[PDB]
Design a protein around this motif. Sequence first.
Motif, PDB file in Angstrom:
ATOM      1  N   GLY A 191       0.794  -1.183   0.110  1.00 12.10           N
ATOM      2  CA  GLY A 191       0.003   0.008   0.002  1.00 12.10           C
ATOM      3  C   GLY A 191       0.912   1.222   0.113  1.00 12.10           C
ATOM      4  O   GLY A 191       0.304   2.348  -0.488  1.00 12.10           O
ATOM      5  N   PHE A 192       2.041   1.204   0.592  1.00 13.00           N
ATOM      6  CA  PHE A 192       2.977   2.490   0.811  1.00 13.00           C
ATOM      7  C   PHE A 192       3.387   2.796  -0.934  1.00 13.00           C
ATOM      8  O   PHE A 192       3.587   3.924  -0.981  1.00 13.00           O
ATOM      9  N   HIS A 216       0.109  11.163   5.253  1.00 16.10           N
ATOM     10  CA  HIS A 216       1.138  10.192   5.478  1.00 16.10           C
ATOM     11  C   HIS A 216       2.362  10.271   4.945  1.00 16.10           C
ATOM     12  O   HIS A 216       2.573  11.393   4.425  1.00 16.10           O
ATOM     13  N   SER A 218       3.073   8.259   2.775  1.00 19.87           N
ATOM     14  CA  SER A 218       2.620   7.832   1.410  1.00 19.87           C
ATOM     15  C   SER A 218       2.332   8.842   0.461  1.00 19.87           C
ATOM     16  O   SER A 218       3.053   9.023  -0.576  1.00 19.87           O
ATOM     17  N   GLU A 268      -7.638  11.789   2.925  1.00 19.10           N
ATOM     18  CA  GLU A 268      -8.030  10.459   3.218  1.00 19.10           C
ATOM     19  C   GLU A 268      -9.160  10.191   3.960  1.00 19.10           C
ATOM     20  O   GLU A 268      -9.958  11.348   4.584  1.00 19.10           O
ATOM     21  N   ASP A 297      -8.369   8.352  -0.232  1.00 18.54           N
ATOM     22  CA  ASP A 297      -7.466   7.332   0.311  1.00 18.54           C
ATOM     23  C   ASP A 297      -7.919   6.505   1.388  1.00 18.54           C
ATOM     24  O   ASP A 297      -8.039   7.001   2.918  1.00 18.54           O
ATOM     25  N   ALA A 299      -7.689   4.306   3.393  1.00 16.26           N
ATOM     26  CA  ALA A 299      -6.974   3.329   4.207  1.00 16.26           C
ATOM     27  C   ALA A 299      -7.634   2.620   5.201  1.00 16.26           C
ATOM     28  O   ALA A 299      -7.733   1.284   5.425  1.00 16.26           O
ATOM     29  N   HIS A 300      -7.953   3.284   6.134  1.00 12.86           N
ATOM     30  CA  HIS A 300      -8.581   2.960   7.451  1.00 12.86           C
ATOM     31  C   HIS A 300     -10.185   2.917   7.164  1.00 12.86           C
ATOM     32  O   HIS A 300     -10.824   2.247   7.953  1.00 12.86           O
ATOM     33  N   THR A 329      -6.022   0.186   1.071  1.00 16.08           N
ATOM     34  CA  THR A 329      -5.138  -0.768   1.463  1.00 16.08           C
ATOM     35  C   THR A 329      -5.917  -2.134   1.777  1.00 16.08           C
ATOM     36  O   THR A 329      -7.076  -2.056   2.130  1.00 16.08           O
ATOM     37  N   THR A 331      -4.338  -4.266   3.990  1.00 21.58           N
ATOM     38  CA  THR A 331      -3.646  -4.505   5.343  1.00 21.58           C
ATOM     39  C   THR A 331      -4.450  -4.389   6.571  1.00 21.58           C
ATOM     40  O   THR A 331      -4.449  -4.920   7.461  1.00 21.58           O
ATOM     41  N   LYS A 332      -5.186  -3.323   6.584  1.00 21.42           N
ATOM     42  CA  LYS A 332      -6.044  -2.792   7.623  1.00 21.42           C
ATOM     43  C   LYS A 332      -7.318  -3.293   8.043  1.00 21.42           C
ATOM     44  O   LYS A 332      -7.952  -2.810   9.015  1.00 21.42           O
ATOM     45  N   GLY A 338      -1.308  -5.509   0.635  1.00 24.81           N
ATOM     46  CA  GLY A 338      -1.438  -5.330  -0.767  1.00 24.81           C
ATOM     47  C   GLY A 338      -2.107  -3.709  -0.863  1.00 24.81           C
ATOM     48  O   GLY A 338      -1.715  -2.781   0.245  1.00 24.81           O
TER      49      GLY A 338
ATOM     50  N   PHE D 285       6.566   2.944   7.561  1.00 22.97           N
ATOM     51  CA  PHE D 285       5.175   3.487   7.223  1.00 22.97           C
ATOM     52  C   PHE D 285       4.264   2.458   6.676  1.00 22.97           C
ATOM     53  O   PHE D 285       3.321   3.191   6.256  1.00 22.97           O
ATOM     54  N   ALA D 287       3.073  -1.896   6.044  1.00 21.72           N
ATOM     55  CA  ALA D 287       2.876  -3.259   6.791  1.00 21.72           C
ATOM     56  C   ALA D 287       4.179  -3.791   6.680  1.00 21.72           C
ATOM     57  O   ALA D 287       4.879  -3.959   5.519  1.00 21.72           O
TER      58      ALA D 287
HETATM   59  C1  LIG Z   1      -1.850   2.131   6.699  1.00 21.71           C
HETATM   60  C2  LIG Z   1      -1.117   3.111   5.892  1.00 21.71           C
HETATM   61  C3  LIG Z   1      -0.296   2.793   4.807  1.00 21.71           C
HETATM   62  C4  LIG Z   1       0.143   1.482   4.971  1.00 21.71           C
HETATM   63  O1  LIG Z   1       0.560   0.767   3.677  1.00 21.71           O
HETATM   64  P1  LIG Z   1       0.295  -0.623   3.696  1.00 21.71           P
HETATM   65  O2  LIG Z   1       1.348  -1.404   2.623  1.00 21.71           O
HETATM   66  O3  LIG Z   1      -1.057  -1.001   3.066  1.00 21.71           O
HETATM   67  O4  LIG Z   1       0.594  -1.269   4.999  1.00 21.71           O
HETATM   68  C5  LIG Z   1      -0.320   3.382   3.599  1.00 21.71           C
HETATM   69  N1  LIG Z   1      -0.801   4.607   3.276  1.00 21.71           N
HETATM   70  C6  LIG Z   1      -2.021   5.283   4.522  1.00 21.71           C
HETATM   71  C7  LIG Z   1      -2.467   6.395   4.166  1.00 21.71           C
HETATM   72  C8  LIG Z   1      -2.039   4.397   5.598  1.00 21.71           C
HETATM   73  O5  LIG Z   1      -2.611   4.908   6.619  1.00 21.71           O
END
Ligand SMILES: *Cc1c(COP(=O)(O)O)cnc(C)c1O
Lengths: 491, 49, 139, 420, 28
Positions: A191-192, A216, A218, A268, A297, A299-300, A329, A331-332, A338, D285, D287
């Motif tokens: 995701g990053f 972030h 990102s 976001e 975005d 993410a959460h 993402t 992951t969360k 991914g 930043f 996972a």
């Molecule tokens: C959780 C977070 C990420 C983490 O990226 P992952 O590879 O999916 O863990 C990326 N961007 C944002 C805005 C996040 O909050």
Amino acid sequence: IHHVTQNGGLYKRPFNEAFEETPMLVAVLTYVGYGVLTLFGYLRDFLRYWRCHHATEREEQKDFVSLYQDFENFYTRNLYMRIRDNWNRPICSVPGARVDIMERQSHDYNWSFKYTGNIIKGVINMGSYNYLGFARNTGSCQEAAAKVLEEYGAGVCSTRQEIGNLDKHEELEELVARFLGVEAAMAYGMGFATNSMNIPALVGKGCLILSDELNHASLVLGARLSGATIRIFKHNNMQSLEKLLKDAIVYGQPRTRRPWKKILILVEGIYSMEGSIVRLPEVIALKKKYKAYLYLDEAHSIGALGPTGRGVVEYFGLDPEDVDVMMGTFTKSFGASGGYIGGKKELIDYLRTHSHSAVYATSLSPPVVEQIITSMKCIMGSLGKECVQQLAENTRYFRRRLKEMGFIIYGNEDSPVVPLMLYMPAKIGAFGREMLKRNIGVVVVGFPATPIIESRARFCLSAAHTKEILDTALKEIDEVGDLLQLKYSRH
Amino acid sequence: ARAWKQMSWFYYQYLLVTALYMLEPWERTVFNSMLVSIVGMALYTGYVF
Amino acid sequence: PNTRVMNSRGIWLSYVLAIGLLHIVLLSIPFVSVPVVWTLTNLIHNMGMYIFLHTVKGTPFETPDQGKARLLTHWEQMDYGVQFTASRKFLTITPIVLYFLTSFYTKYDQIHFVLNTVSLMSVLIPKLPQLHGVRIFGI
Amino acid sequence: TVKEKEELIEEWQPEPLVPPVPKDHPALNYNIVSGPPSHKTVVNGKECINFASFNFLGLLDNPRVKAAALASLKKYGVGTCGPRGFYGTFDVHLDLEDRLAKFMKTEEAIIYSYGFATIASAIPAYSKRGDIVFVDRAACFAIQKGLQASRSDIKLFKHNDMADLERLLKEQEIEDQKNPRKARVTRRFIVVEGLYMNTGTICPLPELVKLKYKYKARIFLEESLSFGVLGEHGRGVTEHYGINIDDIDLISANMENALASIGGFCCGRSFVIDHQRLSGQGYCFSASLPPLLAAAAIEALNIMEENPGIFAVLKEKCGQIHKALQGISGLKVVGESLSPAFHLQLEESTGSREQDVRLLQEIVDQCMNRSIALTQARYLEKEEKCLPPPSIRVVVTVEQTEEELERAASTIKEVAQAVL
Amino acid sequence: YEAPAYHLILEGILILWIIRLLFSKTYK
Ligand SMILES: *Cc1c(COP(=O)(O)O)cnc(C)c1O
């Protein structure tokens, strides 16, 4: 219909956020705490002119220019190294509701650690990203992931535009597009590296990016790689978004006064720190007035917000067609790894060819694609879509409970992240060590990742938290919040 | 006896505010001495004047 | 993050009381007199303000802008380069208001006018806007 | 400005977010693979042996690797909920770092979650807007984004070529005796890649290690393809040249090629590896690496240590697909005899590149009907900043079984002359 | 009291330096 406030933003539900202002007496005592650490910071760094052991730049054939700026390593050895025994904790079980954490101590005052023999069994964690609770080693949700791993292998040895493009990848990208409600999507490796390798494919040289104060790393790094002007507006301040957006059109570049080539907005869904849902209908009805673009975005946001949760766009009752590009993402909320970007079909076909990651970086592993697929089936239809009604209860129960106990909580009143406010820097390393004695692990965020006097701690709720598991944790913030006297609010 | 254990909390509460807690106790008594020896100096001038 | 450090909540009220924490200590010395209380607390103030704002360049932490703040001192980077913001001028009025009370106290001497004023010009000369990037023969 | 004027400007038109993409008609033909990308893969419904999968050691289809990745999925789960600081560092995240430190024979070994962002996120931790970096001009695209994120002035030198790298360092000794204060804090680096993905050659470390000290730079080796098979143990170009690992200051790689996993490590001395945890920028930043992918990397490390003879049969198998291929009309072999990943670009190049790409696509497409799958080496045109000619790649594994490897040299001599 | 020679002149400069300093309002 609730509010049509001023900009045209139409709220269906009541909003009801609350950021409570920090007291005067507390905000004097914090600077004394940062004062005595920087005082002994220069006193300790003075006493290192003679020879807790250091790293020792190699001596044999070196003494070139010194590799690091020593003054920029100040906080990582005088405020971080003092209390880094938390937020690095090795765990040895499935990060669900209860987590088995390895026990370690320091004979070196946190310059070096050592694992003794123990496994601290049955710790309720509140610091992991497990909203819908799809992270478990049982059940038929992850039973289908092992079927893929005994067939394909544990990773594609290629790139998307090369040979490596499985039938699983085309099967996933069709599933995400129906789940969001958009035409096409594309799944990425992490995701990053979705934001950091696609924002330079959208905007070019003469564009403009109106990003928030805290996105972030990102969305910041994705904006530094595209050479473009970056203007910061304040956090959830639609009067300061509009004023930068009005003064962008009627002016130009700073040097020449040509028009902007295109402008987009990086916001976001749920901001992670100080968890606050963005005022999204006052951005949709604002980007149609100034013809800008929107980069949402989730993410959460996805999996958590709204009934049958498909992000914050369903949470306000909007359509996903009016958001230009919906990154998120896996992951969360889905218990995987991914990321994706979804939008119009004419957008994805550009990002399947000019993408920085379809051509150089490898794709998703084949077994973690199936964990994404079998998690998105359970939400559309087994602890599936009854858990988003269950995280809707835990968000409401846990939030008003801590507030009426005298604690001070940031954020919107229906966000799964509950930021609790530690002010002093010594209450950062005390509250982290105090909860772990009482069978509960939290995530505490210090000075440079926050402002000076914010220094908060953070609670990530989960639908795997039942009532008795959550009521036990509220008993243990009652003792610790009264022991460290962190009752700052006046209500 | 309970007025003695509770008084030790007011020292522990003094460790959290003004950040005496993670201060490596070899360096705690340096700050404890400078906090006493100035107030002990603010009584020597405090009694005369 | 050293561009927003003097424009947070309660940094002014904790900067006035730091002068009082320095002055009540220095007035509490046995072998001293009240002219060299206000003479002493003016040198210690304007030396700290010249060593914490006009000599130290960079950040104690690591800035993710790849060190754009590495060559600039801490005065040159408050609130991202704008001069007469709400909290940059308060750090200029404050050595002046201290200078007037150390002018009424000490009763307008000769060699304490020598020592207090050239320690007061030593903090105001770099606080002009037309001396931004100039570093005269050193650092 | 008059208030009515600010309503006149708001008839303003932005460029659309995406262009109407196709030049003539590039849809690029995403080759949908049915099943595993194994030895006997089936691409677009055609059963064929592959020559673009980077599992040189054949560790993807190995039942020991699938066994260790299954027995870790049944006790940890699939993903790691959260980053690596905030409760996301498992046992295997410590066990795999401790294996790669002892397999490279150095102190520490970091792990990133993604093979691209292991050197795009390791370079900007060190060079910061003032430093001077010398890059070999044909490095991968993963290196070329660490050089843009770290706003340090880059000075490119010609590929596999000394005495144009000496010329750039003499431009700093002139700069050293010009402003002696500024050249005291520059901390210049040298970023080279051990075996190149874009050319398939090997760079001369002994004329580059001994030249590090006379001109006071630091070497950031990025052995992405050189890891796995160069040496008699699989340590890369540092064991092939017989030099000490301690001379190279940061060995980056990725676990994606020749290990059949995801992610990348950067091993090195603990003076330098510890700093990429507080400023790694993608380490803290995102996972962390999922634990089923980490256990497959431990078992791949066990096969590479307990049977070190697999690195020998990959070597002389490169001595039979490279020797038996040169001397043909139409195209030239531009990889070395030691590298397992070639390039097979065409000599007597045409005019426009998009036609030249189209002519080269015919060689791959006509040969996929003959059960021999290849690739076509995609690039980015207007982003890559020094971009190679159009090529095709021939990648060999240890599971090639020579009698059907010599068929692949025969059928690609046959179709290279019937098209060109 | 109330009269040094070359000090109230210099104190008279700075009290007029503040009123200029309190009204500047702008820069780059
Ligand atoms: C959780 C977070 C990420 C983490 O990226 P992952 O590879 O999916 O863990 C990326 N961007 C944002 C805005 C996040 O909050």
